[PDB]
Coordinates of C-alpha atoms in Angstrom, one line a residue:
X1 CA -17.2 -30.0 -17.1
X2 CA -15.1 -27.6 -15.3
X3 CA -14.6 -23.9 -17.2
X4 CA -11.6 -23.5 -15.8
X5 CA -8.1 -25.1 -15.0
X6 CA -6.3 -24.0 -12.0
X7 CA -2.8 -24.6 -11.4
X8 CA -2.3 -27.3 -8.6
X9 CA 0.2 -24.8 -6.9
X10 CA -2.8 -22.1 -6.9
X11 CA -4.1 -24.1 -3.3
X12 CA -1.0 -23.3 -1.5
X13 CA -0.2 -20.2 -2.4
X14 CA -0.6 -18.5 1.6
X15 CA -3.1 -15.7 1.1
X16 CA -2.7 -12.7 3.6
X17 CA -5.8 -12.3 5.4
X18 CA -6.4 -8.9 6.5
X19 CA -5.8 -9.3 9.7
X20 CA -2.5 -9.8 9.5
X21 CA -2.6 -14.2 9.3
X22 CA -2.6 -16.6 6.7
X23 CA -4.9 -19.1 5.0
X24 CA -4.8 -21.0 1.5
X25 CA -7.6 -22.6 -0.6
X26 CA -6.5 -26.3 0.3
X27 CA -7.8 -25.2 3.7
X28 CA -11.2 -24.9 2.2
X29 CA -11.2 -28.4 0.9
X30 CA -14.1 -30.5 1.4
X31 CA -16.5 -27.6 0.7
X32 CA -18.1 -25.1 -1.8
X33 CA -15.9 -22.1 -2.3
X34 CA -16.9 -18.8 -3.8
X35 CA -13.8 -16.4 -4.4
X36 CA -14.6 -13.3 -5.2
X37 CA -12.2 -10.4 -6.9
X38 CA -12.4 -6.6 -6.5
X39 CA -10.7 -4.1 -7.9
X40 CA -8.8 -1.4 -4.7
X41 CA -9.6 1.8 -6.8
X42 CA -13.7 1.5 -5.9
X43 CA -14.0 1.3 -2.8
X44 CA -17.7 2.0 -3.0
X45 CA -18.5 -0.9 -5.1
X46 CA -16.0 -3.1 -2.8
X47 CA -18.0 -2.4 0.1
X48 CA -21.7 -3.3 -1.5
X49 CA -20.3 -6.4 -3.3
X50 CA -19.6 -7.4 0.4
X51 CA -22.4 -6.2 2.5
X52 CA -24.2 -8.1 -0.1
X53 CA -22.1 -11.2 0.4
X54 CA -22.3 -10.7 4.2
X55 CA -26.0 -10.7 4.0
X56 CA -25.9 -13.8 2.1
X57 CA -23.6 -15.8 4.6
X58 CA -26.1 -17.4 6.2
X59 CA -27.7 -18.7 3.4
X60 CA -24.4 -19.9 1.6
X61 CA -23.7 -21.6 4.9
X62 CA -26.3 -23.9 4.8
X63 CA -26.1 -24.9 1.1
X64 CA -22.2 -26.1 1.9
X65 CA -19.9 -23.0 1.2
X66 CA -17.5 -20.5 2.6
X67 CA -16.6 -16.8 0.9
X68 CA -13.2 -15.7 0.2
X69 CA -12.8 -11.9 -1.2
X70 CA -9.6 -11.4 -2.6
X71 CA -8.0 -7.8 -3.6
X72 CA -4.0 -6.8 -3.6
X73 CA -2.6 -4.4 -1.2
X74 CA -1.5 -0.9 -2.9
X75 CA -0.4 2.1 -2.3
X76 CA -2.0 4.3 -4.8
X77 CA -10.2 4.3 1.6
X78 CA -9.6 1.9 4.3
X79 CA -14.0 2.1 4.5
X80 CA -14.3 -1.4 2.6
X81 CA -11.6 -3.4 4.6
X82 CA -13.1 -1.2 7.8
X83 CA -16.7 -2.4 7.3
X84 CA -16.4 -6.4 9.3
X85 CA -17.5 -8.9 7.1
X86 CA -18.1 -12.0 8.1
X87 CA -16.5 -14.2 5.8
X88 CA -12.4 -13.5 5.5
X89 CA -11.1 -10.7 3.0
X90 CA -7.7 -11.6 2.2
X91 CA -4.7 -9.3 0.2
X92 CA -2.6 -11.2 -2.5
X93 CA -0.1 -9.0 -1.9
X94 CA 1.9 -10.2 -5.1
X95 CA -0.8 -10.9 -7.9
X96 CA -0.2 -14.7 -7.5
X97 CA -3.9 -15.5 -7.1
X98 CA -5.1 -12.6 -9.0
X99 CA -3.0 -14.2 -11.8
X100 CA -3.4 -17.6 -11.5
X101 CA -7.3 -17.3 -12.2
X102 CA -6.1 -14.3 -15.0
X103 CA -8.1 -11.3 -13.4
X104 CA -5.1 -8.9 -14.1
X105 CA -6.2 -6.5 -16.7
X106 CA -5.0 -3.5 -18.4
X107 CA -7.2 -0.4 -18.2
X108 CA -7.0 3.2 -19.2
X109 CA -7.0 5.6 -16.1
X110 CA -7.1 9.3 -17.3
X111 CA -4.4 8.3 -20.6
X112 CA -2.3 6.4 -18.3
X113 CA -2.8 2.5 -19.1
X114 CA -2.6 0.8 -15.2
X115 CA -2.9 -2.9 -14.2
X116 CA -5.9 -3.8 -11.8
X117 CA -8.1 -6.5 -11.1
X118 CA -10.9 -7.2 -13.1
X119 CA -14.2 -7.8 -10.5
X120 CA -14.4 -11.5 -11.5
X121 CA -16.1 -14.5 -9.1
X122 CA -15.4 -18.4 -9.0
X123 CA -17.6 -21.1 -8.2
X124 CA -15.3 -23.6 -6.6
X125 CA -16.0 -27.4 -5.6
X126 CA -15.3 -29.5 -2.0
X127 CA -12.8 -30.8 -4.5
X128 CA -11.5 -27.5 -6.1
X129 CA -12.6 -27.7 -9.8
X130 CA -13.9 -24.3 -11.1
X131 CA -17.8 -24.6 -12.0
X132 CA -18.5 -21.3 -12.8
X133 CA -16.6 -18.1 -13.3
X134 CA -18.0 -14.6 -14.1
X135 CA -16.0 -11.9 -15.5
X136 CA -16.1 -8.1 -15.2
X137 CA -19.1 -8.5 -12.9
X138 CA -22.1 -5.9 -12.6
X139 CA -22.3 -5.5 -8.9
X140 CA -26.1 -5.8 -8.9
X141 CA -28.1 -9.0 -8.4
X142 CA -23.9 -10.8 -8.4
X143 CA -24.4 -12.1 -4.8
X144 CA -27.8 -13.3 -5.6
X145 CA -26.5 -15.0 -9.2
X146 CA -23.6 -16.6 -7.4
X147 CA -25.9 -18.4 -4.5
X148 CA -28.0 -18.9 -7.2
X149 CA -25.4 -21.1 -8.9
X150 CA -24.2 -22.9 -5.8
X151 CA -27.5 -24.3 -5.1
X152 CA -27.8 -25.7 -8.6
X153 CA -24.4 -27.2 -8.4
X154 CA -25.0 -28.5 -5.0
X155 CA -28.6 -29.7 -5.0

């Protein structure tokens, strides 16, 4: 079965890419989708979680899927959005995606309780039902996991 209900409205939501132009997840219909959170306040671990990804593409290409990397624009490095992936990095500049798959999460930053994103990935179907969903992800080996999954799903 599917580990995870979306809401429908989830697919239209328009995602800011970081370019400056839009896109939503009903425009990846008809393919795999892997949608990949990271948190803004590690910028080293958002740019390795991509360069992996990037490395990847590729290979995620040919077994049916496109990459989405979500974050949310704030203003408490540039480096990670500076590096060029090639797969889109998009800014949900109002939590609505974040939310939707629930990867707003309270943490403790020096005593002061803060909301960010917890480094979460979904496995997404040509027909949008969540496969797979991992949770507070360990950077190392996730990439590899994930591709990992798609293949079993798809072949």
């Amino acid at each position: 079965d599917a580990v995870l209900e979306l809401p429908a409205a989830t697919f239209d939501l328009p995602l800011s890419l970081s370019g400056g132009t839009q896109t939503t997840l009903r425009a990846h219909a008809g393919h795999w989708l892997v949608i990949y959170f990271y948190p803004k306040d590690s910028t080293p671990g958002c740019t390795t979680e991509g360069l992996d990804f990037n490395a990847l593409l590729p290979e995620f290409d040919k077994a049916g899927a496109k990459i989405l990397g979500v974050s949310r624009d704030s203003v408490k490095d540039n480096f990670c959005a500076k590096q060029g992936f090639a797969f889109p990095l998009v800014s949900d500049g109002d939590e609505a995606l974040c939310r939707a798959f629930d990867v707003i999460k309270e943490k403790n930053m020096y005593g002061k309780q803060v909301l960010g994103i917890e480094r979460s990935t979904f496995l997404l179907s040509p027909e949008g039902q969540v496969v797979q969903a991992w949770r507070k992800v360990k950077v190392a080996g996730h990439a590899d996991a994930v591709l990992a999954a798609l293949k079993a799903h798809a072949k």
